[PDB]
């Protein structure tokens, strides 16, 4: 548990439906959502691989569970069920205990995906932006659509806004 989901970001966004993780920017030009496509695609690939690993790693053979025994062979019968029930027990203890664990793991995975996304932009904005809580930032300068597009892309160009940000922050 990394403290990003149900942590410093209390709730999710219903309006951002085309991804799992995203940004919400607010400018003079306007406000808007933008899902992060790369992280969402990587997470989708991971979840798909996990589901396929759970599903397609059980290859069985043609068997016919079920045998007929008369009165004169009860031990025989009592052995057969001891096999059958036994197998069921194992599977019923594995599958039920399997899903649970991966469920937890999945709920950790998404959390990490959010947390890293919060860290990456932090390392990009530095002192040029101030954390206002709720897991997001307020800029010390004027960011147009180009600035926020660059922040989302991964190339903020910190030095260019450094001096105005310094002038506005030292207040």
């Amino acid at each position, epitope marked *: 548990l990394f403290g990003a989901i149900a942590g410093f970001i209390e709730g999710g966004w219903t309006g*951002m439906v085309d991804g799992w993780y995203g940004y919400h920017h607010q400018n003079e030009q306007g406000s808007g959502y*933008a899902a992060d*496509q790369k992280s*969402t695609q990587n997470a989708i690939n991971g979840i798909t691989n996990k589901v396929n690993s759970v599903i397609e790693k059980m290859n069985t053979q043609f068997t016919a569970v079920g045998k007929e025994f008369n009165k004169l062979e009860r031990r025989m019968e009592n052995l057969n069920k001891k096999v059958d029930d036994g197998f069921i027990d194992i599977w019923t203890y594995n599958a039920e205990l399997l899903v649970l664990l991966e469920n937890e793991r999945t709920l950790d995975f998404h959390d990490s995906n959010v947390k890293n996304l919060y860290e990456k932009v932090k390392s990009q904005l530095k002192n040029n932006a101030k954390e206002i809580g709720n897991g997001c930032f307020e800029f010390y300068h004027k960011c147009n659509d180009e600035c926020m*597009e660059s922040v989302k892309n991964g190339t903020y160009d910190y030095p260019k806004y450094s001096e105005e940000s310094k002038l506005n922050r030292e207040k």
Partner: antibody
Framework: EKLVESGGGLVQSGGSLRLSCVGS????????FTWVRQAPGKGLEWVAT????????YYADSVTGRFTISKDNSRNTIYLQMNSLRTEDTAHYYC????????????????????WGPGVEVVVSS | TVIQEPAMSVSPGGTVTLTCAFS?????????PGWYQQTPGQPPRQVIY???SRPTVVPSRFSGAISGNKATLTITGAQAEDEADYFC??????????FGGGTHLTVLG
């Protein structure tokens, strides 16, 4: 299910246009849309896209900050407001509708565009 | 980026193939290679979506597949109404679908 495009023409450099596309035969509330352009002597280039509910919006790196794609569900219309047009914006513009895909509860952009529009020729000059 | 061939030709009733490849990589089924047909004066039409899936309306002369890390569109028995520009749209982890330059198929008459 057809898309009809309109609102383009000859505009001066530094001006603005508002291309509009009207869809007849379906509802826009559950489909994602895109605007694509073909420059003269060049291949098809992605311009902008809007999600199913209109919340998410993505722009090409060359037209960011100048183009705004919006959706009006009441009129069944998709608008591309183009501002501060430059000479490189001369093209033929198509409005296309993304095919419906649903991956783990999320809307997709995998399969491409199923319904395109006839296109509108936008030319700028000085 | 996506690379196609500038122009190709086919005689009527002849089978032709159009290729679509990345400039610096390979094209797999996860790229969802779509094929769009564009005639002059009319909207482009999605001939192929996904690797091989074809819409009902589209004739069955058009089939597609991934061969040699390259998407391919095969037209078996090219009629006279298949003289258009064919564009290949690939998927790269975003709504930004890169398109090919275009291939002008000339049905010789």
């Amino acid at each position: 299910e057809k898309l009809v495009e309109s609102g383009g023409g000859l505009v001066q450099s530094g001006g603005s246009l508002r291309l509009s596309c009207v869809g007849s035969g379906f509802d826009l509330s559950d489909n994602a849309f895109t605007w694509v352009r073909q420059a003269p002597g060049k291949g098809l280039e992605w311009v902008a896209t809007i999600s199913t509910n209109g919340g998410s919006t993505y722009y090409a790196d060359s037209v960011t900050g100048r183009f705004t794609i919006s959706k009006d569900n009441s009129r069944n219309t998709i608008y591309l407001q183009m501002n501060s047009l430059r000479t490189e914006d001369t093209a033929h513009y198509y409005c296309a509708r993304y095919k419906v895909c649903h991956r783990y509860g999320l809307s997709c952009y995998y399969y491409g565009m199923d319904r395109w529009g006839p296109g509108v020729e936008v030319v700028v000059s000085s | 980026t996506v690379i196609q061939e500038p122009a190709m030709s086919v005689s009527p009733g002849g089978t032709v193939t159009l290729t679509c490849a990345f400039s610096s990589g390979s094209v797999t089924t996860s790229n969802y290679p779509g094929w769009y047909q564009q005639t002059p004066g009319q909207p482009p039409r999605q001939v192929i979506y996904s690797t091989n899936s074809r819409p009902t309306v589209v004739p069955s002369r058009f089939s597609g597949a991934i061969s040699g890390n390259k998407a391919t569109l095969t037209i078996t028995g090219a009629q006279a109404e298949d003289e258009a520009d064919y564009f290949c749209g690939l998927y790269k982890n975003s709504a930004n679908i890169p398109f090919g330059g275009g291939t002008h198929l000339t049905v010789l008459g």
